[PDB]
Scaffold this motif. Structure first.
Motif, PDB file in Angstrom:
ATOM      1  N   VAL A 101      73.962 -49.151   6.538  1.00  0.00           N
ATOM      2  CA  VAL A 101      72.883 -50.033   6.965  1.00  0.00           C
ATOM      3  C   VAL A 101      72.138 -50.551   5.744  1.00  0.00           C
ATOM      4  CG1 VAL A 101      72.560 -48.938   9.220  1.00  0.00           C
ATOM      5  CG2 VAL A 101      71.285 -48.084   7.219  1.00  0.00           C
ATOM      6  N   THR A 102      71.431 -51.665   5.934  1.00  0.00           N
ATOM      7  CA  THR A 102      70.469 -52.137   4.949  1.00  0.00           C
ATOM      8  C   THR A 102      69.067 -51.741   5.403  1.00  0.00           C
ATOM      9  OG1 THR A 102      71.861 -53.999   4.251  1.00  0.00           O
ATOM     10  CG2 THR A 102      69.517 -54.176   3.779  1.00  0.00           C
ATOM     11  N   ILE A 103      68.253 -51.258   4.472  1.00  0.00           N
ATOM     12  CA  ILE A 103      66.870 -50.882   4.759  1.00  0.00           C
ATOM     13  C   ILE A 103      65.949 -51.933   4.158  1.00  0.00           C
ATOM     14  CG2 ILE A 103      65.067 -49.160   4.476  1.00  0.00           C
ATOM     15  CD1 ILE A 103      67.468 -48.260   6.196  1.00  0.00           C
ATOM     16  N   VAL A 104      65.053 -52.473   4.980  1.00  0.00           N
ATOM     17  CA  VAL A 104      63.972 -53.347   4.533  1.00  0.00           C
ATOM     18  C   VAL A 104      62.670 -52.596   4.767  1.00  0.00           C
ATOM     19  CG1 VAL A 104      62.798 -55.534   4.906  1.00  0.00           C
ATOM     20  CG2 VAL A 104      65.251 -55.439   5.095  1.00  0.00           C
ATOM     21  N   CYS A 105      61.852 -52.438   3.726  1.00  0.00           N
ATOM     22  CA  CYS A 105      60.765 -51.486   3.872  1.00  0.00           C
ATOM     23  C   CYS A 105      59.523 -51.918   3.107  1.00  0.00           C
ATOM     24  CB  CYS A 105      61.228 -50.085   3.494  1.00  0.00           C
ATOM     25  SG  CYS A 105      61.894 -49.954   1.856  1.00  0.00           S
ATOM     26  N   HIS A 106      58.375 -51.405   3.569  1.00  0.00           N
ATOM     27  CA  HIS A 106      57.051 -51.803   3.097  1.00  0.00           C
ATOM     28  C   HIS A 106      56.156 -50.579   3.098  1.00  0.00           C
ATOM     29  CE1 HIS A 106      52.927 -53.719   3.939  1.00  0.00           C
ATOM     30  NE2 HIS A 106      53.295 -54.166   2.751  1.00  0.00           N
ATOM     31  N   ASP A 107      55.366 -50.410   2.038  1.00  0.00           N
ATOM     32  CA  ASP A 107      54.297 -49.394   2.015  1.00  0.00           C
ATOM     33  C   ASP A 107      54.905 -48.030   2.335  1.00  0.00           C
ATOM     34  OD1 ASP A 107      51.137 -49.005   1.990  1.00  0.00           O
ATOM     35  OD2 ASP A 107      51.851 -48.054   3.844  1.00  0.00           O
ATOM     36  N   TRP A 108      54.322 -47.248   3.245  1.00  0.00           N
ATOM     37  CA  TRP A 108      54.872 -45.935   3.540  1.00  0.00           C
ATOM     38  C   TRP A 108      56.226 -46.010   4.222  1.00  0.00           C
ATOM     39  CZ3 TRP A 108      54.088 -41.831   1.114  1.00  0.00           C
ATOM     40  CH2 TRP A 108      52.840 -41.556   0.545  1.00  0.00           C
ATOM     41  N   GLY A 109      56.573 -47.146   4.831  1.00  0.00           N
ATOM     42  CA  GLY A 109      57.931 -47.290   5.323  1.00  0.00           C
ATOM     43  C   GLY A 109      58.938 -47.228   4.198  1.00  0.00           C
ATOM     44  N   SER A 110      58.523 -47.621   2.988  1.00  0.00           N
ATOM     45  CA  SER A 110      59.395 -47.485   1.826  1.00  0.00           C
ATOM     46  C   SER A 110      59.453 -46.046   1.334  1.00  0.00           C
ATOM     47  CB  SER A 110      58.994 -48.460   0.711  1.00  0.00           C
ATOM     48  OG  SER A 110      57.799 -48.053   0.076  1.00  0.00           O
ATOM     49  N   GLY A 111      58.333 -45.320   1.374  1.00  0.00           N
ATOM     50  CA  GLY A 111      58.403 -43.897   1.080  1.00  0.00           C
ATOM     51  C   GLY A 111      59.401 -43.187   1.979  1.00  0.00           C
ATOM     52  N   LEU A 112      59.312 -43.448   3.282  1.00  0.00           N
ATOM     53  CA  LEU A 112      60.233 -42.821   4.218  1.00  0.00           C
ATOM     54  C   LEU A 112      61.649 -43.346   4.025  1.00  0.00           C
ATOM     55  CD1 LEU A 112      57.859 -43.035   7.270  1.00  0.00           C
ATOM     56  CD2 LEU A 112      58.646 -40.907   6.216  1.00  0.00           C
ATOM     57  N   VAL A 128      65.879 -53.529   0.539  1.00  0.00           N
ATOM     58  CA  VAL A 128      64.882 -54.552   0.239  1.00  0.00           C
ATOM     59  C   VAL A 128      63.532 -53.867   0.364  1.00  0.00           C
ATOM     60  CG1 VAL A 128      63.906 -56.793   0.845  1.00  0.00           C
ATOM     61  CG2 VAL A 128      66.373 -56.310   1.254  1.00  0.00           C
ATOM     62  N   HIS A 129      62.729 -53.915  -0.695  1.00  0.00           N
ATOM     63  CA  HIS A 129      61.448 -53.230  -0.675  1.00  0.00           C
ATOM     64  C   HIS A 129      60.348 -54.149  -1.179  1.00  0.00           C
ATOM     65  CE1 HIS A 129      61.191 -52.097  -5.056  1.00  0.00           C
ATOM     66  NE2 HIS A 129      62.479 -52.379  -4.944  1.00  0.00           N
ATOM     67  N   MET A 130      59.130 -53.892  -0.704  1.00  0.00           N
ATOM     68  CA  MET A 130      57.991 -54.738  -1.017  1.00  0.00           C
ATOM     69  C   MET A 130      56.736 -53.890  -0.882  1.00  0.00           C
ATOM     70  SD  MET A 130      58.516 -56.943   2.426  1.00  0.00           S
ATOM     71  CE  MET A 130      60.267 -56.615   2.272  1.00  0.00           C
ATOM     72  N   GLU A 131      55.810 -54.043  -1.830  1.00  0.00           N
ATOM     73  CA  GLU A 131      54.562 -53.279  -1.838  1.00  0.00           C
ATOM     74  C   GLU A 131      54.831 -51.815  -1.496  1.00  0.00           C
ATOM     75  OE1 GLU A 131      51.162 -53.956  -2.499  1.00  0.00           O
ATOM     76  OE2 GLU A 131      51.736 -55.793  -3.537  1.00  0.00           O
ATOM     77  N   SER A 132      55.741 -51.232  -2.264  1.00  0.00           N
ATOM     78  CA  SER A 132      56.443 -50.004  -1.925  1.00  0.00           C
ATOM     79  C   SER A 132      55.955 -48.835  -2.774  1.00  0.00           C
ATOM     80  CB  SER A 132      57.937 -50.232  -2.168  1.00  0.00           C
ATOM     81  OG  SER A 132      58.103 -50.939  -3.396  1.00  0.00           O
ATOM     82  N   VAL A 133      56.364 -47.633  -2.369  1.00  0.00           N
ATOM     83  CA  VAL A 133      56.017 -46.389  -3.063  1.00  0.00           C
ATOM     84  C   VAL A 133      57.217 -46.040  -3.940  1.00  0.00           C
ATOM     85  CG1 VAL A 133      55.239 -44.004  -2.833  1.00  0.00           C
ATOM     86  CG2 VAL A 133      54.622 -45.697  -1.095  1.00  0.00           C
ATOM     87  N   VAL A 134      57.213 -46.524  -5.181  1.00  0.00           N
ATOM     88  CA  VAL A 134      58.375 -46.359  -6.050  1.00  0.00           C
ATOM     89  C   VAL A 134      58.265 -45.189  -7.018  1.00  0.00           C
ATOM     90  CG1 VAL A 134      59.141 -48.741  -5.872  1.00  0.00           C
ATOM     91  CG2 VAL A 134      57.507 -48.105  -7.627  1.00  0.00           C
ATOM     92  N   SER A 135      57.091 -44.591  -7.170  1.00  0.00           N
ATOM     93  CA  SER A 135      56.891 -43.540  -8.157  1.00  0.00           C
ATOM     94  C   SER A 135      55.545 -42.880  -7.890  1.00  0.00           C
ATOM     95  CB  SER A 135      56.927 -44.104  -9.585  1.00  0.00           C
ATOM     96  OG  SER A 135      55.748 -44.833  -9.865  1.00  0.00           O
TER      97      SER A 135
END
Length: 296
Positions: A101-112, A128-135
């Protein structure tokens, strides 16, 4: 446009000891599939104007995280990252997904989402990530100055009155990070899961308390984010798209953190933190282009 109209397109499934609501454009199909993950304090409604650009190319799923949107409320009021991940992981296993699957994620949805990808690396065809928790944040000094006092207050004992009683995240932070003015119907869709004062609003308070801040905590989230950051930074075989928001909130920091990540392209759209409300068309078009490149 209304909350009612959006949730009318969604379905509910029992998950673990509760239930989750989700959008699914083509239930059960193993064609190209994209999962959209919202964060705090939104729901799958956040993606309503992005998904129509992607559906022609893929089965599109968008769950409401537990305690949010039209998903169930948990009677222990425990909505830490690990609780959300337990529910989201069970949801992934419940909706009959294809092998990748492809994951498109934002904010805590990117953490998860980043954590799920790190734990299921052979299931990931792109991110695909945006305004994400990268570190993890190295310290409070790295939190944006204009919001630093508010988030320290949310993480203090004052957070309960701010959120449970006054709905601070919905009523103040959400509109402050949208450039346009939401219509009454759109604002009411965001308000709907949290209309009743008290513990219904707990997810919007626990989320800021999970932000991984070095030297502060929480240590379990710091370790999870460090682990997926290590994997992402060397993930040369995972195509990635960073949708940068101009001027954004965390976007400027994400650009620096991810500058040497392999196999990542960047596109820039106008927006603050909740960029989907300001540039849904350009975001959806960027995702569609990214999917087409995978298919070649």
């Amino acid at each position: 446009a209304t909350g009612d109209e959006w949730w009318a397109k969604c379905k509910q499934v029992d998950v673990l000891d509760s239930e989750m609501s989700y959008y699914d454009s083509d239930p059960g199909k193993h064609k190209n599939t994209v999962i959209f993950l919202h964060g705090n304090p939104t729901s799958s409604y956040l993606w309503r104007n992005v998904i129509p650009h992607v559906e022609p190319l893929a089965r599109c799923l968008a769950p409401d995280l537990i305690g949010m949107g039209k998903s169930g409320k948990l009677p222990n009021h425990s909505y830490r990252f690990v609780d959300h991940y337990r529910y989201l992981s069970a949801w992934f296993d419940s909706v009959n997904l294809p092998e990748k699957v492809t994951i498109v994620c934002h904010d805590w949805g990117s953490g998860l989402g980043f954590h799920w990808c790190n734990e299921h690396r052979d299931r990931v065809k792109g991110i695909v990530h945006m305004e994400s928790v990268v570190s993890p944040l190295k310290g409070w000094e790295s939190f944006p100055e204009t919001a630093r006092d508010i988030f320290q207050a949310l993480r203090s004992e004052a957070g309960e009155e701010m959120v449970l009683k006054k709905n601070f995240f919905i009523e103040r932070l959400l509109p402050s990070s949208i450039m346009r003015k939401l219509s009454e119907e759109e604002m009411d869709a965001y308000r709907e899961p949290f209309v009743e004062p008290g513990e219904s609003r707990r997810p919007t308070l626990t989320w800021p308390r999970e932000i991984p801040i070095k030297g502060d905590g929480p240590e379990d989230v710091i370790e999870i984010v460090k682990s997926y950051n290590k994997w992402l930074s060397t993930s040369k075989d995972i195509p990635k798209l960073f949708i940068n928001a101009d001027p954004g909130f965390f976007s400027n920091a994400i650009k620096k953190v991810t500058k040497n990540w392999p196999n990542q392209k960047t596109v820039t759209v106008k927006g603050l933190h909740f960029l989907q409300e300001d540039s849904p068309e350009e975001i959806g078009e960027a995702i569609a282009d990214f999917l087409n490149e995978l298919t070649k």
